[PDB]
Amino acid sequence: IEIRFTLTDVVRSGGAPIVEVDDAATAMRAVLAIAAGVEGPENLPKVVDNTATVTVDWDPERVADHTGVTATFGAPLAPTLTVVPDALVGRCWPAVFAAIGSAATEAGFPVIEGLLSLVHLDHAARLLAELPKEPAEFTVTAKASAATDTEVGRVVPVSVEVRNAADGALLATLEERFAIRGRTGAAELTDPVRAGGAISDNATDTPRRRRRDVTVGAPVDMRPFAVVSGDHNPIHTDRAAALLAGLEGPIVHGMWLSAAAQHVVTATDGKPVPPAKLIGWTARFLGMVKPGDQVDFRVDRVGIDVGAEVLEVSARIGSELVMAATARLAAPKTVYAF
Amino acid sequence: AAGGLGVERFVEIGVKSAPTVAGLATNTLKLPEYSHSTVEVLNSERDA
Amino acid sequence: AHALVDRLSAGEPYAVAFGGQGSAWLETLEELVSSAGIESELATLAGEAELLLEPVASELVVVRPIGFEPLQWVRALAAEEPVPSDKQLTSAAVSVPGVLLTQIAAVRALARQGMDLTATPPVAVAGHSQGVLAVQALAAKGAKDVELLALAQLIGAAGTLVARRRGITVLGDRPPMVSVTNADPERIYELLEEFSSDVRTVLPPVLSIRNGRRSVVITGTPEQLSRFELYCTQIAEKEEAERKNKLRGGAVFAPVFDPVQVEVGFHTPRLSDGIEIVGRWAETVGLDVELAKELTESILVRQVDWVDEITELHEAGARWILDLGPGDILTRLTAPVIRGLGIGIVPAATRGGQRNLFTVGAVPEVARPWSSYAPTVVKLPDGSVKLETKFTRLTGRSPILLAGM
Structure with missing residues (x-):
């Protein structure tokens, strides 16, 4: 697939010998549209209008590939579940991206977005008290809660609802917030301001408890995760696009890391029984990660929400902070006798 | 066993009465249960 | 001038053996590259590996990207810094092809020096597990070489997609492959059948390899295998109270149980969905030969009765x-199996055993045919009959004595 651009030269202004076509933004979109969707998925919402994901089925081999893509052993970790809540992101990905531009973006924004300048801020999965299972089919709905601009750029929080097809109920809620860095707007204004929390009705407070010291390698190439997740962004694959965006290299998918640190919290504090235990997880990406990376994670036990332990995770490659993560985990199941 | 064998926690309540049926469970966890399972015996009195 | 080959031609016959999975292949492949002064084969083998994947009309969507260029990993490993983890390299997808390449490169090494002599003649070519693959096209024309690596790429791929390890624990440590020692094949299957009575059809353990008389290998799901591990321990302990009563029929058994480093169940029904897919993977390639269907079943589902075949x-x-398998596996497994029946076995790509191969005088290692020491009859001047043994020959008397009492 090809990407074309156009220039125009007026030399009356010597300091501005080159001025290039204003159709760039719209021209960039048509290029991404061909590659991304290939008109394969089709629904035609405006950004406010709901984005629907038709139908989704989870094969046992899609369970294996993901659990095999991110693995932990040396720390006595045993992943168990039909569908890890991390697997939600693979289903909702192609729909979320469609909301990144629109007429509402045309009204209040210049509609100037470099896709290479796209930055993932936060990702979280909130459960409706239902957990994902075997062969039952899923159908997902994506909505943009707000379209915001910041001092550092344009931000689009996206809400996602995952539903079981056969049963016809909403299982989980997925939250994503993306950052394009060039834009301003009258739609939603933020300077430094954004906030999110995992909250529960009944709570207990605890003291800091060191649980595990984790060692996690980054994959050699980012293409394996790109295939499964459905993220084809050339930043993580092509070196020419990564260098053009002014990056340290073919940056590891933040989404892979998200499932990487999670799988540990899944198995460690979660113990040989993760499946009914973690009812939610949140992930903040502090810094960029190159492939072939030895990263050290540390999960601690902080406090209690709704009878579920909260677990805080910090990430370091050498001195650099990488991921800030926090999870709600049920305790190891208790049997009482009087 | 029919519902899966993954980690279980056995807690006894009533304060000082807690060591008894736990010690009953403990010795029981030994003899038939030799299968090497991860099990936690906890007492309200002792293990608070 | 290779005496054995020269022996092979006029005198004693020969058979080729290929090792299977669990051979610790990479370090052998790394050394084989370093010990190789001739890269000629590796040029075509690398290109055909690239080629054969592209035209594939079989599904193979997940497999091709997760496949890796063999030339790059080698040169990386030769710079001494780069290499993925053993856990990644041992996975069937990239491991199964790599094992064959090590074996194929092992064929070429001997073929370099003595080919005119070191050409065809075995009596037969046999293999173990995935080793039966490299056996077939070695007996076929030279254009079929990659077809092994091609099928191996397909074998480990579907096997991985169908069933892969979902958990492991440092204790034991617990794999899909388990081995018990000292116990009868009947007794092991008994405890197997005793345990399999308590579990569902989806995860039964079964007997995969019978390595010898009292040494076997049982395989299945790691968790269920760990359960079988429990019963054998209880019996071992209950029989301990027996042995310490100082009674022989009432004596403890002293078996040896301990798992293996193999990452995935082989020769089990858990691979049953893999056979079909693998079969189509071959026909969509120029790999078409009528044994691709039979090899798969032998490797993926059907067990391997080993002792009986090479015997x-x-x-x-x-x-x-000879055994061209990585490190050397199945070369020594076979030796005490046969032992003194006249067979002897040199590990191939082993420098010590290859020193035999290349010389006129160092060749004839022929293990002792126990029948050689079989007793004989002797006559004497006064005409006495004497039964001849190593004892009688010395003493000059009947091979019988009244012990000190």
Whole structure:
């Protein structure tokens, strides 16, 4: 697939010998549209209008590939579940991206977005008290809660609802917030301001408890995760696009890391029984990660929400902070006798 | 066993009465249960 | 001038053996590259590996990207810094092809020096597990070489997609592959059948390899295998109270149980969905030969009765057996199996055993045919009959004595 651009030269202004076509933004979109969707998925919402994901089925081999893509052993970790809540992101990905531009973006924004300048801020999965299972089919709905601009750029929080097809109920809620860095707007204004929390009705407070010291390698190439997740962004694959965006290299998918640190919290504090235990997880990406990376994670036990332990995770490659993560985990199941 | 064998926690309540049926469970966890399972015996009195 | 080959031509016969999975292949492949002064084969083998994947009309969507260029990993490993983890390299997808390449490169090494002599003649070519693959096209024309690596790429791929390890624990440590020692094949299957009575059809353990008389290998789901591990321990302990009563029929058994480093169940029904897919993977390639269907079943589902096969080619009276398998596996497994029946076995790509191969005088290692020491009859001047043994020969008397009492 090809990407074309156009220039125009007026030399009356010597300091501005080159001025290039204003159709760039719209021209960039048509290029991404061909590659991304290939008109394969089709629904035609405006950004406010709901984005629907038709139908989704989870094969046992899609369970294996993901659990095999991110693995932990040396720390006595045993992943168990039909569908890890991390697997939600693979289903909702192609729909979320469609909301990144629109007429509402045309009204209040210049509609100037470099896709290479796209930055993932936060990702979280909130459960409706239902957990994902075997062969039952899923159908997902994506909505943009707000379209915001910041001092550092344009931000689009996206809400996602995952539903079981056969049963016809909403299982989980997925939250994503993306950052394009060039834009301003009258739609939603933020300077430094954004906030999110995992909250529960009944709570207990605890003291800091060191649980595990984790060692996690980054994959050699980012293409394996790109295939499964459905993220084809050339930043993580092509070196020419990564260098053009002014990056340290073919940056590891933040989404892979998200499932990487999670799988540990899944198995460690979660113990040989993760499946009914973690009812939610949140992930903040502090810094960029190159492939072939030895990263050290540390999960601690902080406090209690709704009878579920909260677990805080910090990430370091050498001195650099990488991921800030926090999870709600049920305790190891208790049997009482009087 | 029919519902899966993954980690279980056995807690006894009533304060000082807690060591008894736990010690009953403990010795029981030994003899038939030799299968090497991860099990936690906890007492309200002792293990608070 | 290779005496054995020269022996092989006029005198004693020979048989080729190929090792299977669990061979610790990479370090052998790394050394084989470093010990190789001739890269000629590796040029075509690398290109055909690239080629054969592209035209594939079989599904193979997940497999091709997760496949890796063999030339790059080697040169990386030769810079001494780069290499993925053993856990990644041991996975069937990239491991199964790599094992064959090590074996194929092992074929070429001997073929470099003595080919005119070191050409074809075995009596038979046999293999173990995935080793049966490299056996077939070695007996076929040279254009079929990558087809092994091609099928191996397909074998480990579907096997991985169908069933892969979902958990492991440092204790034991617990794999899909388990081995018990000292216990009868009947007794092991008994405890197997005793345990399999308590579990569902989806995860039964079964007997995969019978390595010898009292040494076997049972395989299945790691968790269920760990359960079988429990019963054998209880019996071991209950029989301990027996042995310490100082009674022989009432004595403890002293078996040896401990798992293996193999990452995935082989020769089990858990791979049953893999056979079909693999079969189509071959026909969509120029790999078409009528044994691709039979090899798969033998490797993926059907067990391997090993002792009986290589013995069968052995009882044909073929004196020599070589093994081009990684490290060397199945070369030494076979030796105490046959032992003193006249067979002897040099590990191939092993420098010590290859020193035999290349010389006129260092060649004829032929293990002792116990029948050689079989007793004989002797006559004497006064005409006494004497039964001849190593004892009688010295003493000059009957091979019988009244012990000190």
